[PDB]
Amino acid sequence: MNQERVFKVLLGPHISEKATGLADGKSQFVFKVATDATKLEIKKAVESLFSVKVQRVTTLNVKGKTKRTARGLGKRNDWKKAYIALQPGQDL
Amino acid sequence: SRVCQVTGKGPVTGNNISHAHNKTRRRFLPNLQHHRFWVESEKRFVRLRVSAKGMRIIDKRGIEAVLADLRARGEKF
Amino acid sequence: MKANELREKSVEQLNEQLLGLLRDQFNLRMQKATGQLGQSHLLSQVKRDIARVKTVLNQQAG
Amino acid sequence: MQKIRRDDEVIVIAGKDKGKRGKVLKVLADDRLVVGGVNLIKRHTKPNPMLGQQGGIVEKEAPLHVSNVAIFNTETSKADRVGFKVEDGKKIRVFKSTQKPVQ
Amino acid sequence: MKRTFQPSTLKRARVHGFRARMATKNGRQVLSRRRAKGRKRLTV
RNA sequence: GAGUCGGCAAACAGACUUUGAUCCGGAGAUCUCUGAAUGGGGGAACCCACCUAGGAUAACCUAGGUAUCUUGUACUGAAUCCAUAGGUGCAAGAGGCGAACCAGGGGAACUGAAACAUCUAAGUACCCUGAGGAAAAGAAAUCAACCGAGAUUCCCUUAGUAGUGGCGAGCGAACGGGGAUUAGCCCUUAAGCUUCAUUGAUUUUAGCGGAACGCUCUGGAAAGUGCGGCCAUAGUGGGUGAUAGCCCCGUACGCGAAAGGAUCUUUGAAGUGAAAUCGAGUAGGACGGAGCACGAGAAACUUUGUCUGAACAUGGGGGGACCAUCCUCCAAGGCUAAAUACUACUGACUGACCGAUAGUGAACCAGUACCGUGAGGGAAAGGCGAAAAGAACCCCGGAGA
RNA sequence: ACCCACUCCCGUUGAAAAGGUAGGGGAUGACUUGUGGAUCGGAGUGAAAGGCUAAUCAAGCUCGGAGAUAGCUGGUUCUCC
RNA sequence: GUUGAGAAGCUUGCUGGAGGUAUCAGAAGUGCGAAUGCUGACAUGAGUAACGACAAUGGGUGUGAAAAACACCCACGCCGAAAGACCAAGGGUUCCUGCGCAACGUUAAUCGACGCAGGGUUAGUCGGUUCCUAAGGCGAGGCUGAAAAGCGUAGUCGAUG
RNA sequence: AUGACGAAGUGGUUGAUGCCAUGCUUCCAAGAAAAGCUUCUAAGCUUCAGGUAACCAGGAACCGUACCCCAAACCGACACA
Ligand SMILES: [Mg+2]
Ligand SMILES: [Mg+2]
Ligand SMILES: [Mg+2]
Ligand SMILES: [Mg+2]
Ligand SMILES: [Mg+2]
Ligand SMILES: [Mg+2]
Ligand SMILES: [Mg+2]
Ligand SMILES: [Mg+2]
Ligand SMILES: [Mg+2]
Ligand SMILES: [Mg+2]
Ligand SMILES: [Mg+2]
Ligand SMILES: [Mg+2]
Ligand SMILES: [Mg+2]
Ligand SMILES: [Mg+2]
Ligand SMILES: [Mg+2]
Ligand SMILES: [Mg+2]
Ligand SMILES: [Mg+2]
Ligand SMILES: [Mg+2]
Ligand SMILES: [Mg+2]
Ligand SMILES: [Mg+2]
Ligand SMILES: [Mg+2]
Ligand SMILES: [Mg+2]
Ligand SMILES: [Mg+2]
Ligand SMILES: [Mg+2]
Ligand SMILES: [Mg+2]
Ligand SMILES: [Mg+2]
Ligand SMILES: [Mg+2]
Ligand SMILES: [Mg+2]
Ligand SMILES: [Mg+2]
Ligand SMILES: [Mg+2]
Ligand SMILES: [Mg+2]
Ligand SMILES: [Mg+2]
Ligand SMILES: [Mg+2]
Ligand SMILES: [Mg+2]
Ligand SMILES: [Mg+2]
Ligand SMILES: [Mg+2]
Ligand SMILES: [Mg+2]
Ligand SMILES: [Mg+2]
Ligand SMILES: [Mg+2]
Ligand SMILES: [Mg+2]
Ligand SMILES: [Mg+2]
Ligand SMILES: [Mg+2]
Ligand SMILES: [Mg+2]
Ligand SMILES: [Mg+2]
Ligand SMILES: [Mg+2]
Ligand SMILES: [Mg+2]
């Protein structure tokens, strides 16, 4: 990242029960990221934005669900999730 | 392929016909031979694959006039 | 923002105008990802403004 | 250009309300229009706690085909057809019978 | 009882996939035929 | 010129629009990844790079380039002295897809012959190559018959005739005549064609205006009944609550383009046609094939796989064995429009065509579902009402059906 | 174990388009087996049964020639004189 | 109901809700019971066979409209070189939670690999990718071949190593 | 479930088909390849580049990962002996 790509990397926080439990207990925050966002681009984006210090980023790709309904077998988009751990003081 | 570099003669088809007139598809091939032709103006031997009629043309016209036609025809020797 | 007033500005001004619009788009994305975005026309209109800026930038700097 | 436009005094020339007058409230894309007080229907609406609707037999206007109304000539007090008198640089609606503007 | 279909996606790809078909001239003909008929799936 | 945020397929949200939105048309911009796919690789939609320039200090970013082959050109460059082969750069071009039509290469069998081998099917099906909007052919070494015709292509005749044919089954002309089109130009270098200007004409891609009807009866509703009118270069169009020339959209008719495309044209410029300079391994011949309606026949002519091989207008080709006389033409160099073929595609109009088991396989989210490893095969399934006015509310029932 | 398939019975519109129970043979080998690859239609492969080549084999499947041909079988729809 | 010798015609009650067609001509996809005809619907067999390993159940409690089958508890029984736990291939969300039971489940179902919704898969060290090659593939030039192509050098792929 | 503490946690024997072992012995049917790796130089490069060692600082990208897997989720049209 060396451009306006910083604004196209993080798609938004993930609002699961596992996400909030991770935010409270540990200092990890689950974000939705672009499917072609590397772990380095996510770390830089969360540091430029949100003005925090990132300790480690782990990512995983999530398969979109199919839901064969209503004259055919549809399919939701594949999406990427990032677990972002900061320093203990920071809360993002 | 079985094509003469000088005359462009290639395989042609036709029939074998027996005494009872049974017809069999056959081919007629050119009398192709490999021959090295001396080129004085190049001080070099040029090996061509020619029919025996193509060799007669080189006798009548010369290798220089034949090779010039080969260059203009594109395909090289 | 209409392209008429966009076409008056310089390349430098246009490039900061894009960076601002991209930050607004990013902020609108964060609001939408938590249900805290009351509007919805801003998402579509912010990306039309980015398209407008990029169109002028393409044709101004040939 | 539409001969009958939104917010126009019209008269119903065909249907159950034939003779009634009203103002065009809505113009639709299926050659239909909504006229105030014309073509009321009783719609049995199931109440919902959301949206603030209490249900009941709600009465509302039903869309009417555009050709079943006519523009109303208040001068002659009867239905009139609409032409288009294209001026030097303007197009405006005139009554066929009197060749006078509708507006 | 072993049946005739013993799936292997690698073998399936190498025998019937898009690049296997495009490699030959009769394979390109299959893709032309299946495009002309309008098959949604072209290869497997 | 007043609505709008596409459809299934709406519901709520949030908005836009007479500072002219949605929408329609022209021109631009953007245009991920795969695919000829072309930086290298690959199990298509993925993986890994390099070079240049710029900008960041970290672990990169932006822009461009990086396939192969052909042609041309420049620089280098062996065995080998000069060279050449080769190598590197650059410029131009090509590759792939598409239903048919065209030219060409290869080329069946079933079948028919009441069996079958010659023959037929048939130079068909199919495979392959190349080209173009058409292609091919084309300006007599052509017919004719002692009279003449006058390039090519296509239609009708001649005629199922002459002929051909295990003279079986079959195949099948030409001369001559009537038509459609019409055009001839050069190798002492042209008619044309292509491209780029350029002068005018149209045409196409959005649109605009567009006449004239009331009362009455039945009826849910009138366009239908009855009575009386009007328009028509517009009267058998589609809708509208039943059947409308006059209610709406249209129709006849008349207008319309900022911009792009196209076709005709008037000039101009190069480029090409272009093979140079009138045709030699050519004409003729022998052998073996193929084609000519013609299957060796008494077999001319064309063509060529093998082998040979002239003459030079005082010459040569043909006129169906062949010879003589006569007539007619000038091959071995080229270019050439029209009449002709086809329709995957776009528009309009039409039908003694279908109307949901029909018509496309497919009226419907169909080459889909499904079947198959795969090539491939391959469905079923339309209609409430004029308008959702799509049944508030009460009761039984599992807060069901 | 694993590979195999000699006997009986069952099953035969099966649990199964070839199985099961009980017995049976080989079980360091000319062994069994996974992954990947090569060979195919007058062709392949065959310790050879005309076996096998996707439940299809004295010449696979698929589409085309193709509506092959059928002196054979079946069928052929309203009325009256 | 009626008329004709017949194919058939005519009148009318009910249903239906917008089209039909005299007469005389003209055209035909013009008449069906058979073709082991084709498509759909529905019978008969018959409420019959069967409900898919003879490892096996009993009770109590709960929930629920409803419990032989769901959950829990107390017993019983079965496998244990598997009927347990994994890796690969193959599959692809079937995983977990809430709501639910029409259809699916060879019965019922409150239960489910079933329906609706949400959630869930985190790697420098595991496995790939990347490096290297086997068989084999493709293969610049090249050689060969009517065309399509065949073979193959330099190379470049290709794990099961 | 909830959050602190948490005793003992030692000897003997037996013992693999696992490891030493890609070893050893023996046989005949004679038992991958390439790279990584170590080392040597050629063209080049010669204050350079590069190499070595020490210290400091930082990094390790991308894809898979749920679940079934002698199975009701794979191949058998089935929740299929
Ligand atoms: Mg980590
Ligand atoms: Mg990961
Ligand atoms: Mg590529
Ligand atoms: Mg490639
Ligand atoms: Mg030299
Ligand atoms: Mg081409
Ligand atoms: Mg016969
Ligand atoms: Mg063209
Ligand atoms: Mg031509
Ligand atoms: Mg004369
Ligand atoms: Mg108008
Ligand atoms: Mg009008
Ligand atoms: Mg009606
Ligand atoms: Mg001549
Ligand atoms: Mg000759
Ligand atoms: Mg001659
Ligand atoms: Mg004669
Ligand atoms: Mg000539
Ligand atoms: Mg149909
Ligand atoms: Mg019907
Ligand atoms: Mg024994
Ligand atoms: Mg035998
Ligand atoms: Mg078999
Ligand atoms: Mg045979
Ligand atoms: Mg035939
Ligand atoms: Mg038949
Ligand atoms: Mg019947
Ligand atoms: Mg009968
Ligand atoms: Mg009985
Ligand atoms: Mg009984
Ligand atoms: Mg019983
Ligand atoms: Mg059971
Ligand atoms: Mg029940
Ligand atoms: Mg198990
Ligand atoms: Mg599911
Ligand atoms: Mg579950
Ligand atoms: Mg049930
Ligand atoms: Mg579920
Ligand atoms: Mg090869
Ligand atoms: Mg090559
Ligand atoms: Mg490799
Ligand atoms: Mg491996
Ligand atoms: Mg797991
Ligand atoms: Mg089965
Ligand atoms: Mg069971
Ligand atoms: Mg089973």
Side-chain angles (χ1 to χ4, degrees), chain A, chain B, chain C, chain D residues 1-49 52-87 89-103, chain E:
Chain A
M1 282 172 11
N2 246 332
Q3 37 266 78
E4 42 208 48
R5 174 91 167 109
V6 194
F7 306 110
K8 301 303 261 231
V9 162
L10 313 176
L11 275 39
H14 199 46
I15 324 290
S16 51
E17 322 68 59
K18 193 185 162 160
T20 66
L22 256 168
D24 300 345
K26 296 166 206 178
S27 204
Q28 320 214 352
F29 296 90
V30 197
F31 265 94
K32 286 206 186 69
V33 289
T35 59
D36 64 2
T38 69
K39 261 135 76 156
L40 176 66
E41 282 179 346
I42 290 153
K43 176 165 173 167
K44 246 134 55 173
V46 180
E47 266 154 342
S48 297
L49 316 162
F50 300 106
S51 82
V52 286
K53 267 150 298 303
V54 174
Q55 171 215 302
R56 168 215 28 90
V57 185
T58 60
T59 43
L60 60 102
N61 286 288
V62 201
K63 267 186 217 160
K65 292 181 203 144
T66 39
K67 312 259 185 157
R68 178 178 256 145
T69 72
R71 75 200 159 293
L73 157 79
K75 209 192 139 311
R76 290 174 175 164
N77 315 320
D78 286 353
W79 59 285
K80 194 184 236 171
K81 145 193 322 173
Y83 288 92
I84 301 155
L86 319 153
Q87 308 310 331
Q90 279 111 288
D91 208 5
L92 201 140
Chain B
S1 33
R2 288 187 182 104
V3 175
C4 177
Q5 312 213 39
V6 165
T7 85
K9 265 185 202 300
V12 299
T13 60
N15 276 315
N16 272 132
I17 302 145
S18 71
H19 177 66
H21 244 261
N22 313 109
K23 266 176 205 26
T24 317
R25 293 311 286 162
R26 72 162 278 182
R27 313 176 90 214
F28 289 93
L29 300 177
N31 191 8
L32 292 161
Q33 321 280 339
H34 288 281
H35 200 262
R36 282 171 327 128
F37 299 91
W38 183 239
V39 184
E40 265 152 341
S41 305
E42 299 169 9
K43 279 299 178 73
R44 172 177 65 121
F45 265 114
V46 165
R47 197 195 188 219
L48 289 161
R49 192 184 181 194
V50 277
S51 43
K53 162 182 208 73
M55 210 158 343
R56 287 179 86 234
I57 292 177
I58 291 176
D59 302 328
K60 169 159 173 155
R61 278 178 49 98
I63 194 58
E64 280 299 350
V66 152
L67 282 199
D69 268 11
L70 251 46
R71 284 193 263 290
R73 221 166 66 168
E75 63 118 8
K76 296 305 174 185
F77 35 91
Chain C
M1 194 147 149
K2 288 325 270 313
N4 282 115
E5 61 224 56
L6 270 197
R7 251 180 306 263
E8 304 161 354
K9 300 166 160 34
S10 61
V11 159
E12 173 244 5
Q13 288 168 90
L14 273 167
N15 272 305
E16 331 316 331
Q17 225 267 315
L18 188 78
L19 275 274
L21 280 166
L22 281 147
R23 186 173 283 279
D24 319 334
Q25 184 181 72
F26 165 76
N27 292 332
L28 293 175
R29 266 184 220 204
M30 302 288 114
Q31 300 180 49
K32 183 206 193 247
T34 48
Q36 258 288 35
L37 174 79
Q39 325 278 46
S40 98
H41 69 283
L42 299 173
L43 285 175
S44 167
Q45 96 171 42
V46 78
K47 76 192 331 216
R48 253 57 141 163
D49 304 9
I50 296 165
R52 231 163 263 123
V53 168
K54 262 154 177 306
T55 311
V56 176
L57 273 161
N58 202 262
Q59 93 203 15
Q60 272 212 23
Chain D
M1 189 159 171
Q2 306 159 15
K3 287 183 179 178
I4 300 203
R5 180 188 171 322
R6 197 192 51 245
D7 186 336
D8 229 339
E9 160 95 329
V10 297
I11 170 153
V12 177
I13 50 144
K16 65 187 180 157
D17 295 305
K18 168 166 67 37
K20 283 186 45 68
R21 301 153 54 176
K23 318 269 181 32
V24 182
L25 314 168
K26 188 94 189 299
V27 176
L28 313 170
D30 35 352
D31 272 87
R32 292 208 282 176
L33 44 78
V34 183
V35 165
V38 161
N39 255 44
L40 286 325
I41 39 81
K42 290 162 273 187
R43 159 84 225 205
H44 300 4
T45 326
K46 260 227 204 292
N48 46 0
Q53 160 81 265
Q54 51 147 21
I57 319 232
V58 174
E59 220 194 356
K60 47 168 213 269
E61 280 111 6
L64 189 139
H65 199 264
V66 72
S67 93
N68 283 1
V69 290
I71 212 86
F72 189 69
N73 219 307
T74 65
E75 284 78 4
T76 42
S77 265
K78 39 167 40 59
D80 217 313
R81 296 195 301 291
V82 156
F84 296 99
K85 189 182 85 198
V86 178
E87 309 226 9
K90 190 62 67 66
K91 186 200 293 188
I92 51 104
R93 278 172 338 146
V94 296
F95 297 110
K96 291 287 211 33
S97 65
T98 78
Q99 309 261 39
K100 209 176 314 298
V102 308
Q103 199 156 333
Chain E
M1 269 151 309
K2 197 222 280 233
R3 296 299 168 187
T4 66
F5 187 50
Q6 298 317 316
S8 153
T9 88
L10 187 269
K11 278 163 76 97
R12 186 174 185 75
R14 289 201 188 148
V15 183
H16 311 291
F18 183 85
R19 307 199 81 235
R21 300 268 193 244
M22 282 298 283
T24 73
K25 211 142 163 283
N26 298 129
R28 282 168 241 140
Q29 264 156 18
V30 173
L31 300 195
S32 283
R33 273 199 311 274
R34 291 180 75 79
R35 271 172 186 129
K37 213 201 184 153
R39 293 276 192 189
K40 170 197 86 145
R41 100 139 171 80
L42 219 54
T43 49
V44 281

